[PDB]
Amino acid sequence: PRNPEFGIFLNNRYLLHNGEGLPKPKDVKETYPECKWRKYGQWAWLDENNVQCYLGPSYKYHAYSPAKNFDPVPSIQRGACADTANPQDFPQGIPRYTISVPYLYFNNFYDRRCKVRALVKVPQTDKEKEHWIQAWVVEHNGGNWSTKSGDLGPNGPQEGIMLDTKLYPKFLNSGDIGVLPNKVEWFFLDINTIG
């Protein structure tokens, strides 16, 4: 069946045409300024009324996230998404590009965002031309890291993502602390819900 069911092939516009003809991105943080790291008994992503909140980066509102690497094989076998049914167009075997996301981007009971498509921007480096890739979310993680620190403490903000071990080094020049020095730009391919 056609995927997406309606409209343009958004993945092709990025992978083959770099986003040409589409608006320049805004940051998904601007969609929900009041969704912050706050304490209500425990530290969590909460709004100004102490209601759980999460974000939905789209092709219009990209996420810019501090990133570590991870091994996708144990995640696929026994991680947070291991019992999720394979959705439309999911690869056989280990997908070429995989990511893990923190609680800033899901609800763990009802909107888990397991085995969904994400586009990730790979900037120019000494090795790589600038280009977009398509990855699958295959894990959830804590994500208490920033571009300056691999560990913000047990209760520190949970913004960080993970990239598979073969995608991560594409972000580096030939010139690594365990978090990439620049935030990684990405969005959920099939989530276009904010104007």
Next chain:
Amino acid sequence: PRNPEFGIFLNNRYLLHNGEGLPKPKDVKETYPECKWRKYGQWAWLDENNVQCYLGPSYKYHAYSPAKNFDPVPSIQRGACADTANPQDFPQGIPRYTISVPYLYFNNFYDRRCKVRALVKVPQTDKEKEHWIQAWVVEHNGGNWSTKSGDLGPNGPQEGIMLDTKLYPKFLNSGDIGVLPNKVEWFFLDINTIG
């Protein structure tokens, strides 16, 4: 386990306290004005770049939808959500209140919103005090109706929802064309993603 995992019990604030202490609602249509009924080969919910789009009404941005009734028993058995795994806190048997939603509110491959919680406002009538109820989404529908017409034609806009046959009559006074005369106010309980 605690549900929601973090933050206040949002359902209790509506069901027991009518939303007290929370902001007055805005319309979810204002979150995405450019998500419109448009033709790209077929008629669909599409943005200004012909990308598929959908909405996520929350406690801050309610949906106001034209509503028909439906029989939840065949939907539970063999409708769009019949093979969805029962999530946390899903009832045994037929839930007391059930709704069906159109494509304006889901992606059918990756964000189906099957077996999720919705709060629905039941206004005062000659029989009912004003109050909120908690319903489960158990079906998807076409929804080519408005408060003035049960049938907007094969290609007409798909905004309409359905309410189970025992919830629907709670919207009427003792004073029915098949669509309720007033739009029904509702939101997804666990989706709080737009500021």
